[PDB]
Amino acid sequence: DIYSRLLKDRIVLLSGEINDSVASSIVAQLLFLEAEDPEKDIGLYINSPGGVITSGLSIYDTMNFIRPDVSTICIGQAAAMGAFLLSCGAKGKRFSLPHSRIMIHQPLGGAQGQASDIEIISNEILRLKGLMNSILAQNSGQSLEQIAKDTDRDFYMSAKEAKEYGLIDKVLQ
Amino acid sequence: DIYSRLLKDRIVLLSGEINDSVASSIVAQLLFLEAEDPEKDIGLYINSPGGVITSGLSIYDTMNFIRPDVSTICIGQAAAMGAFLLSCGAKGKRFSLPHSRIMIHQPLGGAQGQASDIEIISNEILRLKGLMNSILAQNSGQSLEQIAKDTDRDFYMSAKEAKEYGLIDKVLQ
Amino acid sequence: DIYSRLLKDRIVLLSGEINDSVASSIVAQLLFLEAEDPEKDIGLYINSPGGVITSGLSIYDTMNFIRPDVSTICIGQAAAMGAFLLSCGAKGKRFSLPHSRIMIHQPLGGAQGQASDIEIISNEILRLKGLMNSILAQNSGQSLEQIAKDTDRDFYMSAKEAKEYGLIDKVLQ
Amino acid sequence: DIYSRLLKDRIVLLSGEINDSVASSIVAQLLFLEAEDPEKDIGLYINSPGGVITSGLSIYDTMNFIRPDVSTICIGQAAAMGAFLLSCGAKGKRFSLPHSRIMIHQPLGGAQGQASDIEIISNEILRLKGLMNSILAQNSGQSLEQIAKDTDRDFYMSAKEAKEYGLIDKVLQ
Amino acid sequence: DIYSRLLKDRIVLLSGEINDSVASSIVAQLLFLEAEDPEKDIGLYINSPGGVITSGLSIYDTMNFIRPDVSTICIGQAAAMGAFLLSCGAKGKRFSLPHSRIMIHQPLGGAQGQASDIEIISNEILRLKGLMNSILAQNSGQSLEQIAKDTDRDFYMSAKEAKEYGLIDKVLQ
Amino acid sequence: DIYSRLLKDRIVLLSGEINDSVASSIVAQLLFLEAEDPEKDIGLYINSPGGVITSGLSIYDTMNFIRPDVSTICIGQAAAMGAFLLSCGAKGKRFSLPHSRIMIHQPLGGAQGQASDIEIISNEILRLKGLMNSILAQNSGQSLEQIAKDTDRDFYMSAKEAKEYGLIDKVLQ
Amino acid sequence: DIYSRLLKDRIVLLSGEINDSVASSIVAQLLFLEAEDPEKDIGLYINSPGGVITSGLSIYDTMNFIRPDVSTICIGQAAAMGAFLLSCGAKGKRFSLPHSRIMIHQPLGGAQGQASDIEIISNEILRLKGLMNSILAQNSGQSLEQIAKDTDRDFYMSAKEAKEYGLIDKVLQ
Amino acid sequence: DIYSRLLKDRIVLLSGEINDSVASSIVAQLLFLEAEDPEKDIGLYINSPGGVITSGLSIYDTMNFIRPDVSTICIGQAAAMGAFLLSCGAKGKRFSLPHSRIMIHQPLGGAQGQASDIEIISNEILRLKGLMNSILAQNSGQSLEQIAKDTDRDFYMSAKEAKEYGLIDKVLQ
Amino acid sequence: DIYSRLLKDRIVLLSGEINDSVASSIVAQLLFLEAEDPEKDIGLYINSPGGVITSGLSIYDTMNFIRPDVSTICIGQAAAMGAFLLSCGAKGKRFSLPHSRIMIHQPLGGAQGQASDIEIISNEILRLKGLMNSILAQNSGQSLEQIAKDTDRDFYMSAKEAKEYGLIDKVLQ
Amino acid sequence: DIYSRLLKDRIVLLSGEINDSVASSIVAQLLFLEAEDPEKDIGLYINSPGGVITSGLSIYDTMNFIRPDVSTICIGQAAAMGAFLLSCGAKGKRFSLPHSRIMIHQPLGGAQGQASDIEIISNEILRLKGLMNSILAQNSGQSLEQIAKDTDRDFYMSAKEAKEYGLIDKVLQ
Amino acid sequence: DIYSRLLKDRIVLLSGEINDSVASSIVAQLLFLEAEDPEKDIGLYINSPGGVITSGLSIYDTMNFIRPDVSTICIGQAAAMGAFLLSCGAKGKRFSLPHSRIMIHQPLGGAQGQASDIEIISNEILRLKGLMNSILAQNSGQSLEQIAKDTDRDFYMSAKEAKEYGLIDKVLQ
Amino acid sequence: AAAA
Amino acid sequence: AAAA
Amino acid sequence: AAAA
Amino acid sequence: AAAA
Amino acid sequence: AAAA
Amino acid sequence: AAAA
Amino acid sequence: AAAA
Amino acid sequence: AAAA
Amino acid sequence: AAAA
Amino acid sequence: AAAA
Amino acid sequence: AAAA
Structure with missing residues (x-):
């Protein structure tokens, strides 16, 4: 197994849509790596178009639950929830x-449902929206108001521009 | 054609679910009857399980838009929007x-869509909700509050109870 | 059309399953016949396997709403809602x-849905069960208890049995 | 035909989604009515959720093209292209x-397709967006900038609010 | 196998929908674990949207059936039966x-079925509601009556709110 | 119409599968001819592979309910319910x-369903089985046992053999 | 109607596959024509790829049941049951x-089904095979052995060959 | 393997629906455990919604065909055949x-099929119904008529109620 | 495994459609080889019809991210993204x-979506168009305007022609 | 119907996609209209997104086959083949x-098919491309080269632009 | 693995339709085998109905790329691309x-698509056609002229004939 | 439904 | 809808 | 059923 | 389309 | 197959 | 089955 | 194509 | 068939 | 499930 | 998304 | 694409 080999080097790969299944996989690998060495850094390579929010939050929280520094490296693409996780990597890494x-x-x-349910789900999607914008803001040095405006619609960036925006720290030339 | 001969007797049949197509038909018949005699009563028989709100609002406003009194008669059932229309008939009829x-x-x-669109559609549906609850409040003689409490979930009633409630003025024995 | 010719002889046919579409046709023919002559009897031939309850109730109420005696004749079969209606015909006819x-x-x-909704529908379906059993009792002369016991599961019987049961008056030889 | 008789009193009904089939019908009715009498007003009642843009434009240009003043009356709802048409009615009507x-x-x-085609299609939709917003501004009295801002996402409003916005002239209260 | 490795450290991941096959696996792991060491703690990480109630109940009872304490850790989300199981964890953990x-x-x-079967099925789900609602009450300190009201519709809350509410003991922020 | 001219000669065509739909049509035509002249014979041409029993019983009961003798002519084929109806034609004709x-x-x-329900349905199917054999025996002169054995499985016959069996009276040479 | 004006010339068109529906339409036409004039010849144009056997036999027995000669004209093609009907035309026409x-x-x-039913169906189809071969033989002048051999598999023929075979009398060449 | 491990502890898990596959697996495991040690108890944990009757009987007879006592423990739910098996457990276990x-x-x-076949199947089902009610009576201490009365329709009960009913011996509270 | 053995030879095969799954596999393999030896060349044999752009770029970036030279060998075909990667190989290799x-x-x-989103997506795809053309010019030695003219529509060439063009360095004959 | 009334005024409406049936409808009307008066003008209102080329060509040829001048009026849109037909209108009209x-x-x-077949079809399509390109130049005045350059990809333009380009003569107001 | 064993004897089986997936496999086995021993012959057994041309060419070029002679043995059939590969085996083998x-x-x-694209695709397939014909003319001794003529349509032949034709050298009998 |  |  |  |  |  |  |  |  |  |  |  090629992946199991790379895991031995503390390299984790998050590729494709993000969902509960994929999240459990990345959670298990993070927890496993800490068990192996709670000090050594971890390299989380990300190539994702995004995915389920709660699922993404489970990886983000685990990244900060374990002791090791989880460095993030974007290859191909880090979109939406994928960009979110990229920004959550250990500061400076x-x-x-x-x-x-x-x-x-x-x-x-x-x-879908009665007015009451749609309203409840709507408020919940909004709460999740404010939460992500809040962290995205704290992770990038942007104001909450600016993040809300920029994410209103699909906001695409090159690696250079995402670095200048504050989502990452360095573009490995 | 039975339906046409019944239309000559000022009888209009609204049966089945309510949608724009059925609504335009009902509206067309009501406008026709006023053009034939804006003085005589119209009998709107309703056996409906309900339907599209705006579709129902078109019928409700036409009934009040034309000059003749539109008497409503529930046979079989008047559910949700159907009950709304039923209670909107000329008082006493x-x-x-x-x-x-x-x-x-x-x-x-x-x-469905971005959190922003879900919020917009959620507010709009709640707007429709507040609208129908108060019209139902004024049509039955009860406080909007008690109506809101009653329509939270399906509220079934016998013809007699509908009369006790204030949706209809009489039960033909 | 041959059905229109029979309607001229005040002969209405109810064939197949009962639903709102079918009910509205029957109701429309009953109202038409009364407008044509609110004194002569009407012949409602019934061959039906049953159908939507509220749909049948509207036909039944319309039978007692108009002035004419609506005689019922079962051909082929009158089942469940079909039998119910058959038993609703003018007494002696x-x-x-x-x-x-x-x-x-x-x-x-x-x-289907939340436990709360499932309960509401279940109570409503029970309201109809009792309403039909009571009306069947009144129509046949049997006690509510007897009807409740006999309708627990499918209860098939011949015309002669049905007459002796009270669901119909006479069996044409 | 109920619709045919209403068309004789110069009333055309626009219900449901707008497309080439519906539009050619609405155009034909309008051309017809002008031939019948190019001086009397026409009553175009609208209850539409919207539709194909070029289609709605054929109706629009046919409205200005003909001599008679086409009055628009919104019943049920006038959404998107449907609302656009309601505002294209003769001033004061x-x-x-x-x-x-x-x-x-x-x-x-x-x-869909090659980047070249996508950019062409995108430019054309943006062109139709400009054209639509432009006419909406001219019809309501709002600035171009205001219309662009308010149509970015669904903008719902009651009849009275549509009046204050400049979309309609009066609300048949 | 990454998961088998975490199992050795007494870690059980319950991610995704809850059902009999999943419950079967969770129960299997718990039994294995206590057999491995009936005194050491067990960590049940939960990231689930909910599922079959009886399936969740099998996990809950097993959690208390075995001797070792079952600590529950919410990551991502714990919704409905997931929130139920999370709250069932050993008090304080x-x-x-x-x-x-x-x-x-x-x-x-x-x-689905006869009126009789529906009332039966309806009572059973009302039983499960009361059963689940009561254990939720016991676990969080809420009154049965309060839980019933709070769970009438989707009731979402943050990790902190969940602590203040009584579903969890503390947040490892 | 072609079938209308033939009906004028009191010729009724029963072609294809027998169901409530086909039955109401035939029954409707038979009631019609009766009203036109209760004494002139009727010619029921049969080319059917069979069909729903109750639907067939409606036709058969009607044939004897009316005054005119209903002659039956088999062209193509008369199978199962079709053969049944053919044998129910007026004796000698x-x-x-x-x-x-x-x-x-x-x-x-x-x-399908519970043992109780399947049992009830099975008994009713057998009742219909005994019912048709009795009638087949009566119309043909054969014994009940002979009919019961011969119809246990598909029993094909030529016109001459059907005659020698008692199902028909003559073959138009 | 086009086909209708032609029927006024005693011209009937059998086009497409033969089934009960079509056979019913053809028989109704032959009966009609006989009703209009039982002496004048009838022209039955045939362009069929074949069809159900009992269905074709109904048309066949009808052609002989009525008094007027039924001349057959093949256009396009007369395959299988089509060729059979073609050969059944009045001798010399x-x-x-x-x-x-x-x-x-x-x-x-x-x-399909039990071995008993499959044998019963096999013999019947064989009976229909023997029946058509002999009739085909009577119509062409060929021995039953010749027809049996030539129809084992598809046997195509030009109009000229079919004439020499005895299936038709003359080619309107 | 998690299940092979528990099986080493003479633990067998019957999860989900019962059919031949599942019954074959369960049966094979019971034989294995007996061959392993015909003296030690076997723990059959049951969490099933039921399934094929013969499949379940298959398990029932094996449980009584091997020498080891088969203890049954209900986790989650034991419904229908699942409850049947749970009650077939060993005396007091x-x-x-x-x-x-x-x-x-x-x-x-x-x-489905012929009347004769439906009757045969119907009888075989009533046979299975009686066989099972009788065994339930025997396993619970309830009279045969009582079981027939209670299982006429779904009969849900708690663990405690199940003990009182006699289906289980003790509740590991 | 066969590929496993080839990997020991530093041989990697990119075959078929390019997407995230395939991209991660290749990325993982290049990282692996890098760890196994950052000096020796790696052989990337390419036989691809093309694929997702962000996917293809991750491979490309990884090829320059690792230390060893990544030699590219086209077999069968190298189309679009596949040809892009080919041209990216170590110069001279x-x-x-x-x-x-x-x-x-x-x-x-x-x-798809609102005009606003369609434009954004259009802009991003055009951005990817310019990005690739730019790199394609740099790798081939052609001018951006030449690459742009040539990639307007499919541009097929032979191996020898690809060398003339600058996409490859040598045709191994 | 309405479309029929307009035809009386010599107005032919071409609405929707262009295929054969639609083509034969428009051709029949153009022939019909010439039969009514080969002198008066004909008004072909066009609102089409395009369609089958040979279909559209039959309409064009028919427009020049009849003596009356066929004036084209674009309403809604005239795309591709729709635009072709529009430009083929009589000069100045x-x-x-x-x-x-x-x-x-x-x-x-x-x-699809063998290489030989693909080539034949490809050449036939290039033939049709050259035919339309040249006829389009003739109708507008543009050089064949300019039309080929402009039709490479979708070329959208407003009414004014269409006039400047030469496809139409005048834009009404 | 049976195949892995035979591979150890330098036996490679190409079975089924040829595509990128199958191609990459055959190619890996080829490369692997020459890595094992660049001198020993390889036995490529072929039983294919043909496939994707470029997929074939990758196998063909690889066959000549490595040093070992790749002997070809046809079993079952070698059609189209499969026949191509068979003839590409080392001369005399x-x-x-x-x-x-x-x-x-x-x-x-x-x-499919624009006339422009269809022409580019057509020319490309014609290019591949000529390439196939030429390499086929070279492997068999036939002239390009014979090949072009013989491959215009499916050209079937026995092993013997294929020997006379020059596609293979000998029939192992 | 039952059929023959 | 409920039925009988 | 049987067809020709 | 919201419904009632 | 009969089930429970 | 009943779910939450 | 485009719609409002 | 070829379209425009 | 809300997604990004 | 975009493909080449 | 192209196949043989």
Whole structure:
């Protein structure tokens, strides 16, 4: 197994859509690595178009639950929830290759049922929206108001621009 | 054509679910009858399980837009939007056959897209909800509050109870 | 059209399953016949396997709403809601051909969603069960207890049995 | 035909989604009515959720093209292209019943193929967006900038609010 | 196998929908663990949207059936049956990561068949609701009556709110 | 119409599968001819592979309910319910063209659900089975046991053999 | 109607596959024509790829049941049951246009169920095979052995060949 | 393997629906455990919604065909055949966790084909129904008529109620 | 494994459509080889019809991110993204077998939604178009305007032609 | 119907996609209209997104086959083949409403089968491309080269632009 | 693994349709085997109906890329691309078992989109057609002229004939 | 429904 | 809808 | 059923 | 389309 | 197959 | 089955 | 295509 | 068929 | 499930 | 998304 | 694409 080998080097790969299944996998690997060495850094390579918010939050929280520094490296793309995780990497250790694209935008979902339920789900999607914008703001040095405006719609960035925006620290030239 | 001969007797049949197509038909018939004699009463028989709100609002406003009194008669059932229309008949002329069932409830719907669009559709549906609860409040003589409490979930009633409630003025024995 | 010709002889046909579409046709023909002559009897031939309860109730109420005596004649079969209606015909004029099969049973349905909604629908479906059992008792002369016991499951019987049961008056030889 | 008789009193009904089939019908009715009498007013009642943009434009240009003043009356709802049409009515004759809902929003579409084609399609939709917003501004009295701001996402409003916005002239209260 | 490795450290991951196959696996792990060492603590990390009630109940009872303490840690989310299981953890050892979202709501389901079967199925789901609602009450300190009201519709809360509410003991932010 | 001209000669065509729909049509035509002249014979041409039993019983009961003698002519084929109806024609007037095929067999059906329900349905199917054999025996002169054995499985016959069996009276040479 | 004006010339068109529906339409036409004039010849144009056997036999026995001669004209093609009907035309009046193709073959079918039922269906189809071969033989002048051999598989023929075979009398070349 | 491990502890888990596959696996495991040690108790944990009757009987007989005592423990739920098996447990070794639910009811199935076949199937189902009610009576201490009365329709009960009913011996509270 | 053995030879095979799964596999393999030896060349044999752009770029960036030279060998075909990667190989070490075919063209895609989103998506795809053309010019030695003219539509060339063009260095014959 | 009344005024409406049935409808009307008066003008209102080339060509040729002048008026839109037909209107009589859109582009198509077949179909499609390109230049005045350059990809333009380009003569107002 | 074992004897089986997936496999096995021993011959058994041309060419070029002679043995059949590969085996080592069939034909394919694209695709397939014909003319001794003529349509032949034709050298009998 |  |  |  |  |  |  |  |  |  |  |  090629991945199991790279894991031995503390390299974790998050590729594709983010969901509970994928999240459990990345959680298990993070927890496993800390068990192996709670000090050594961890390299989380990210190439994702995004995914389920709660699922993404489970990885973000684990990243800060374990002792090791989880460095993030964007290859290919880090969009929406993928960009979110990239930004959450250990401070000063959020990287990207030169041709990766990074995109951020507001949450998406659906509500079906009685007026009361749609309202409840709507308020919940909004709360999740404010939460992500809040962290995205703290992770980038942007104001909450600015993040809300920029994620209103799909906001695409090159690696250089995402670095200048504050989502990552260095573009590995 | 039975329906046309019945139309000559000022009888209009609204049966089935309510949607724009059925609504335009009902509106067309009401406008026709006023053009034929804006003085005589119109009998609107309703056996409906409910339907699209704006579709129902078109019928409600036309009934008040034309000059003749539009008497409503519930046969079989008047549920949700159907019950709304039933209660909107000319005061004193809202009827029901003895074994009809009347049911009132809050609106149902769906929202899909960005959190911002879900919020917009959620507010709009709640707007429709507040609108129908108060019209139902004024049509029955009860406080909007008690109506809101009653339509939270499906509220079924016998023809007699619908009369006690204030949706119809009489049950034809 | 041959059905229109029969309607001229005040002969209405109810064939197949009962739903709102079917009910509105029957109701429309009953209202038409009364407008044509609110004194002459009407012949409602019934061959039906049953259908939507509120749909049947509207036909039944319309039968007692108009002035004419609506005689019922069962051909082929009158089952569940079909039998119910058959038994609702003018007293002394509920008929059946000799090989017709009559059958009565409790309502059937389905509920889905939150426990709260499932309960509301279940209570409503029970309201209808009791309403039909009571009306069947009144129509046949049997006690509510006897009807409740006999309709627990499908109860098939011949015209002669149905007449002796009280659901119809006479069996045409 | 009920609709045919109403057309004789110069009333055309626009219900449901707007497309090439519906539009050619509305155009044909308008051309016809002008031939019948190019001086009398025409009453175009609208209850539409919106539709294909070029289609709605054919109706629009046909409205200005013909000599008769085409009055618009909103019943049920006038959303998007439906609302656009309600505002294109003759000045002083753009009406609405008390409970209709009006909504305006930017265009929606799809693009597939090579980047070259996508950019061409995108430019054209943006062109249709400019054209629509422009006419909406001219019809309501709002600035171009205001319309662009309010149509970015669904903008719902009651009849009275649509009046204050400049979309209609009066609400048949 | 990454998960088998974490199992050796007494870590059990319950991620995704809850059902019999999943419950079967969770129960299997718990039994194995206590057999491995009936005195050491067990960590049940939960990231679930909910699921089959009886399936969740099997996990809950097993949690208390075995001798070792079962600590629950919410990551991502614990909704409905997930929030239920999280709250069932050994008192004092119920945790959540800082950005998790907890939600509780009443049971959902369906009934098909005769009126009699529906009432039966309806009572059973009302039984499960009361059963689940009561254990939720016991676990959080809320009164049965309060839980019933709070879970009438989707009730979402943050990790902190979940602590103040009584579902978890503390947040490892 | 072509069928209308033939009906004018009191010729009724029963072609294809027998169901409530087909039955109401035939019954409707038979009641019609009766009103036109209760003494002039009727010619019921049969080319059917069979169908729903109760639907067939409606036709059969009607044939004897009316005054005119209903002659039956088999062209193509008269199978199962079709053969049944053909044999129910007025004595002496049951015919068949020289190359028709007549088939008789026991009822076919289905039943699903609880043991109790399946049992009830099974008994009713058997009742219909005994009912048709009795009649087949009566119309043909054969014994009940002979009919019961011969129809246990598909029993095909030529027009001449159907005649020698008692199902028809003559073959138009 | 086009086909209707032609029927006024005693011209009937059998086009497409043969089934009960079509056979019913053709028989109704032959009966009608006989009703209009039982002496004048009838022209039955045939362009069929074949069809159900009992269905074709109904048309066949009808052609002989009525008094007027039924001349057959093959255009396009007369395959299988089509070729059979073509050959059944009144002697000396079986025609074909110069480029029509004629094809004959043994019957095709299917059977499912217990071995007993499958044997019963096999013998019946064989009976229908023997029956058509002999009739085909009577019509062409060929021995039953010759027809049996030639129809084992698809046997195509030009109009000229079909004439020499005895299936038709003359080619309107 | 988690299940191979528990099996080493003579633990068998019957999760989910019962059918031949599942029964084959369970049966094979019981034989294995007996061959392993015919003296030691076997723990059969049951969490099933039921399933094929013969499949379940298959398990029932094996449980009594091997020498080891087969103890049954209900976790989650034991419904229908699942409850049947739970009650077939060894004398005094039938347990249940505190929040499990127990359900018993009559057999469900289907039959199609000839009247003769439906009757045969119907009888075989009633046979299975009687066989099972009788064994439930024997296992619980309830009279046969009582079991037939209670399983006529779904009969849900708590673990405690199940003990009192006699289906289990103790509740591991 | 066969590929596992080849990997020991520093041989990697990129075959078929390029997407995230395939991209991660190749990325993982290049990282692996880097760890196994950052000095020796790596052989990336390419036989691809193309694929997702961000996916392809991650591979490209990884090829320059690791220390060893990544030699590219085209087999079968290298189209679009596949040809792009080919051209990216270590200068002087981009090969192709004599009958391989190489193809280059602009990006293809799709966009759906509001005019606002369609434009954004259009802009991003055009950004990816300019990005690739730029690199394609740099790798081949052609001018941006030449690359742009040539990739307007599919541009197929032979291995020898790809060398003439600058995409590869040598055709291994 | 309405469309029929307009035809009386010599107004032919071409609405929707262009295929054969639609083509034969428009051709029949143009022939019909010439039969009524080969002298008076004909008004062909066009609102089409395009369609089958040979279909559209039959309409064009028919327009020049009849003696009366066929004037074209673009309403809504005239895309591709729709634009072709619009431009083929009699000189000086090609019009457009103020907000119509006109688009022209090369043909689209498909080809399957052997290489030889693909080539034949490809050449036939290039033939059709050259035919339309040259006729389009003739109709507008543009050089064949300019039309080919402009139709490479979708070329959208407003009414004014269409006039400047030469596709239409005048834009009404 | 059976195949892995035979591979150890330098036996490679190409079975089924040829595509990128199958191609990459055959290629890996080829490369692997030459890595094992660049001197020893390889046995490529072929039983294919053909496939993707470039997929084939990658195998063909690899066969000549490595040092070992790749002996070809046809078993079952070698059609189209499969026949191509068979003939590409090392001179004097192209074989076939007694009853294998060999078939050759021109390329098959498809093209959709703009006339421009269809022409580019067409020319490309024609390029591949000529490439196939030429390499086929070279491997067999036939002239390009014979190949072009013989592959215009499916050209089937026995192993013997394929030997006379020059596609293979000997029939291993 | 039952059929023959 | 409920039915009988 | 049987067809020709 | 919201419904009631 | 009969089930419970 | 009943779920939450 | 485009719609409002 | 070829379209425009 | 809300997504980003 | 975008493909090449 | 192209196949043989």
